[PDB]
Amino acid sequence: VDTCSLASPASVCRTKHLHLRCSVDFTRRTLTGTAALTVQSQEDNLRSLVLDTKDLTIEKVVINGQEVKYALGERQSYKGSPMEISLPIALSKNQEIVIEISFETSPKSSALQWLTPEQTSGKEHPYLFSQCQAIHCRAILPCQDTPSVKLTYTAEVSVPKELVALMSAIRDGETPDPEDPSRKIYKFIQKVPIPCYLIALVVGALESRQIGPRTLVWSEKEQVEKSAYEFSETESMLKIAEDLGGPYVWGQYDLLVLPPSFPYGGMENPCLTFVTPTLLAGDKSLSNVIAHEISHSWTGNLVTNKTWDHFWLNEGHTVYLERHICGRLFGEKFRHFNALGGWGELQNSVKTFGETHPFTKLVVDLTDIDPDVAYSSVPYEKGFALLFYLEQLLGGPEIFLGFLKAYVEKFSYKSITTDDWKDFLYSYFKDKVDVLNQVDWNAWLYSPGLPPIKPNYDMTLTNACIALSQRWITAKEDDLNSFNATDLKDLSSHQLNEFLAQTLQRAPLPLGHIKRMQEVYNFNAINNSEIRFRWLRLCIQSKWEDAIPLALKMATEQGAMKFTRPLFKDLAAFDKSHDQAVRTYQEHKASMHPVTAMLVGKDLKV
Ligand SMILES: [Zn+2]
């Protein structure tokens, strides 16, 4: 059923368990060890099975203390090489077997990012972190790579003594390596079944702070004390999640703040949530962002898309829940605020892709397509748009939350397609079918472009933003004096961010306009990364030279691509700062993430 996997489908055999034993070598950049897969045959007379491998060197395959025979098919592009394992004895229905595979990862493996010490905070020890999503788990260990298969797993990781290993799991024990006194062994147990793309690993110099009963925050000695402050409210958000979707079933929720070099956004990995450093503003104003990954534990980690075509099932419901979390934090019209923002992001994604492009469909077809090339915000905000539309159509947020609960409770720890979700939607709402039959299903699910209808959003918190932004865009030299510092009296940090987003939408402003904006609003003082980003772009595109240093510092102070790359783009496009931005790139590129380096360097034409 899954077009992105070469392994045996879940209809033949299913992996129920993974016991991982491995060691981390930072000199060779390799994970060497053994992956022991418990396989349950779903049919009689099963003599062989296939697994996904990508750039893996296979030593041997042991079944019941004896080496079996295997063959590695040819690599197909991003899909990798299939691995055929010949079973010694035929398997009956439900007969279970344990296949142990001795494997070593490649240094160029796409699932594992190795960071040099200069690319970390401490500038002393190296770093390692995994990105499995979507299909990259096959580049770590042989497995069935597909969300349609869920498995519990236990792992034992050997790392240099001075470092620490975390995974997505409950930490069990720590013991000095029996055969290597210079190394340590860390143990992990994941009791809840998960797809293999939620297996995560981090190895580096890490400390911890306990910010809640079940919550530790992990990071390097530089960042732990700040993250402990910013994220102190995560326990209350967790309790909100339990209020909406019921008790937390994964048993521990930790947080790992990646080095400042981390280019991407947060990851939902179970029991350990990755956090981007850009979220530390010092005021806790961006902490609510975390509410996304939290909701993943209640929606989409429990109920998983059966194939990646169905990815919307995962994120969409997740988003729907997260905006309810924020809904109770800042109020309802704020939930509407982030809703309208999400619709805006959908607009930009569609017009950038084009309204005819297949990747704008809610259920895509990934057959020959790389899952990471087609990735966009469509399955997030279009899915949320559908569920919000059905919320307002089916009688309200309370009712549709009831639906959400029934959905999770029914499909928890399983995988489903879109048709399954729609079947259960008609089953739950069966009194209301008359309404449901007026939805256009072919258009919403399978048709590109924007959805055929739009939900009704509350405009107040947005209308303030547009009011001020327009005031500045329409301002004339005579007007600039009337502006006062009180204009921000009622606005949130989120509203200020939207204000600078709308004001930046409109292209350069008279230099004196933004110089005044700095005088009254003192935007230079706020360290919030979103607002500071849009503010510094507003300054640089407006030909203000005083912002050159600031725009530069931020560009190299954080590694997030959504920030770094546009800042270097503008600093290059500004003819006054171009040279300086080039040589600054040449200066800091060694400490940049390897991807952001060549990417910003190609943008700078080096
Ligand atoms: Zn997500």
Task: Say yes or no: 330 and 425 in one domain.
Answer: yes
Gapped junctions in the chain, after residues (C–N > 2.5 Å): none
Q: How far is the CA of 265 from the centre of ligand 1 (A)?
A: 10
Which residue among the candidates 153, 186, 253, 380 is catalytic per the annotation?
Answer: 380
Contacts of 443 (CB under 8 A, 6+ apart): 451, 452
Within a domain: 560: yes
Within a domain: 70: yes
Within a domain: 2: no
Q: Which two tokens stand for residue 22?
A: 């491995």
Q: Which two tokens stand for residue 469?
A: 């932004």
Q: Of 260, 284, 301, which marks where a domain is finished?
A: 301
Q: How far is the CA of 210 from the centre of ligand 1 (A)?
A: 25
- CA 282 → CA 138, 217, 229, 436, 585, distances in Å? 39, 16, 8, 46, 27
Instruction: Give the domain CATH number at 228.
Output: 3.30.2010.30
Q: What is the DSSP string of 285-315?
A: SSGGGGHHHHHHHHTTSSEEESSGGGTHHHH
Task: Say yes or no: 473 and 567 in one domain.
Answer: yes
Task: Say yes or no: 194 and 101 in one domain.
Answer: yes
Distance CA 81, CA 572 (A): 42
Degrees, nearest 5: CA angle 179-112-81: 100
- Domain limits for position 398: 302-458
Phi-psi region of 508 (alpha: psi -120 to 50; beta: other; left: phi over 0): beta
Within a domain: 4: no
Task: Say yes or no: 121 and 188 in one domain.
Answer: yes
Q: How far is the CA of 159 from the centre of ligand 1 (A)?
A: 30
Q: Are 571 and 540 in contact (CB under 8 A)?
A: yes
Task: Say yes or no: 282 and 321 in one domain.
Answer: no
Distance CA 33, CA 18 (A): 13
DSSP bridge partners of 243: none
- CA 497 → CA 285, 394, 533, 604, distances in Å? 11, 33, 9, 27
Which residue among the candidates 220, 268, 293, 381 is catalytic per the annotation?
Answer: 293
Indicate the DSSP class of residue 450.
S
Task: Say yes or no: 319 and 356 in one domain.
Answer: yes
Q: How far is the CA of 289 from the centre of ligand 1 (A)?
A: 11
Q: What is the DSSP string of 100-158?
A: EEEEE--TT-TTEEEE-GGGSSSSSS-EEEE--TTTGGGGTS-B--STT-EEEEEEEEE
Task: Say yes or no: 439 and 578 in one domain.
Answer: no
Distance CA 264, CA 585 (A): 19
Contacts of 468 (CB under 8 A, 6+ apart): 487, 491, 499
Contacts of 24 (CB under 8 A, 6+ apart): 31, 128, 157, 158, 159, 160, 163, 165, 203
Task: Say yes or no: 242 and 181 in one domain.
Answer: no
Q: Are 82 and 168 in contact (CB under 8 A)?
A: no
Distance CA 34, CA 587 (A): 41
Q: Which amino acid is it at 64? A: N
The overall longest dimension of the chain from CA atoms, in Å, is 88
Q: How far is the CA of 437 from the centre of ligand 1 (A)?
A: 29
Task: Say yes or no: 209 and 199 in one domain.
Answer: no
* 492 burial via Cβ count (<10 Å: 0-12, 13-18, 19+): middle
* SS3 letters across 360-404: HCCCCCCCCCCCCCCCCCHHHHHHHHHHHHHHHHCCCHHHHHHHH
Q: How far is the CA of 268 from the centre of ligand 1 (A)?
A: 7
Per-position b or e across 248-259, b if 16+ CB within 10 A of its CB: bbbeebbbbbbb
Q: How far is the CA of 147 from the centre of ligand 1 (A)?
A: 15
| Known catalytic residue at 381 | no
Task: Say yes or no: 160 and 211 in one domain.
Answer: no
Q: Which amino acid is it at 303? A: V
Within a domain: 1: no
Instruction: Give the domain CATH number at 443.
Output: 1.10.390.10
Distance CA 214, CA 21 (A): 27
Q: Of 204, 229, 254, which marks where a domain is finished?
A: 204
DSSP bridge partners of 272: 254
Within a domain: 505: yes
Q: Of 301, 327, 356, which marks where a domain is finished?
A: 301
| Known catalytic residue at 380 | yes
Within a domain: 200: yes
Q: Which amino acid is it at 491? A: L
Q: How far is the CA of 176 from the centre of ligand 1 (A)?
A: 36
Instruction: Give the domain CATH number at 586.
Output: 1.25.40.320
Q: Into how many domains does the chain fold?
A: 4
The verdict on whether omega for the bond into residue 406 sits within 30 degrees of 0, i.e. cis, is: no
Task: Say yes or no: 337 and 452 in one domain.
Answer: yes
Task: Say yes or no: 526 and 540 in one domain.
Answer: yes
Q: Which amino acid is it at 246? A: G
Distance CA 598, CA 199 (A): 28
Within a domain: 5: no
Contacts of 314 (CB under 8 A, 6+ apart): 296, 300, 303, 304, 305, 379
Q: List own/partner pairs for 431-434 with CB under 8 A and 24 or more apart.
A: 432/394, 432/395
| CA pseudo-torsion sign 412, 415, 417, 418 | positive
